[model samples]
Target chain A: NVDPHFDKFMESGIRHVYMLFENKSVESSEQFYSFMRTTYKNDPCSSDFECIERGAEMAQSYARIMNIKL
Target chain B: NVDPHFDKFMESGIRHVYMLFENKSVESSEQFYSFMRTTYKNDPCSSDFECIERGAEMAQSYARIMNIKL
Candidate 1:
């Protein structure tokens, strides 16, 4: 069994975010990577459940910044 | 400098595909992981360029199955 909504959200959400990068929405790749490294470095997710929860939250945060409605 | 499109593709694309695992899209986590293993095992991508190119293609392939348009 799985969280369908959460899984669906991530699947579509991540792809949309990637398009933002392809479109040069971020100033530079370094900036994008720095953002990732910083996020992961600060993340305290230690288990699969925690990772999924954190990942969903992060996905939502990025979606908001990218003007995505999911 | 990095290839923005390629780097971005990897970031977002990997996340989206990971969602498939969270959602039970492929029946079980083992199945999903097996698919990844098979992909990497058969992959001939050796350098960053080839890796990116292959990653982009894989993203597109998965996107199609997931009904993502990017």
Candidate 2:
């Protein structure tokens, strides 16, 4: 991680997701971790701003599908 | 641009490069712009932190080749 704070970057996002989930599915949450790690490995490069946009858009997209407040 | 501030994300980095360059190479600097735009278009996703690492490493690599302080 470029910033030590990033260790917890996903922490709050995960917290929000769990807070919104039906039953707090650990399996699905772990999948998110797997997906992010895979993304980090596969990506050639990216900036902080770019990542935030992607994160926000993806979260908003899912929130739309889930009928949850964002 | 996720944040309005991102409009100048490249500003300081470019400033450093220009200050270091002998000839103030607009050609190379514009190429950097082209390169970043191409990167944004090509990448599926990236975080701000991820981008900073990539930028730092690439800059340092070139500084090495240019025999300049980084």
User: Which lDDT tens digits does candidate 1 get at residues A1-70?
Assistant: 8644334333443454367347343453444355555665675455555555555565545445544422
Which is the leading candidate under TM-score? 1
lDDT value, residue A18 of candidate 1 = 68
Could you list the CA RMSD of all candidates, in the order they appear? 16.4, 23.7
- Model 1 residue pairs with clashes: none
Off by over 4 Å in 2: A1-24, A58-70, B1-70
Clashes of 2: 9
Residue-wise C-alpha lDDT for candidate 1, range B15-36, written one tens digit per residue: 8435533544445344434544
lDDT per residue for candidate 2 within A1-70, as digits (tens), equals 3543332333332343334443434654554445444543554126766554544443333334333321
- Docking quality band of candidate 2, CAPRI definitions: incorrect
How does residue A49 of candidate 1 score in lDDT?
56
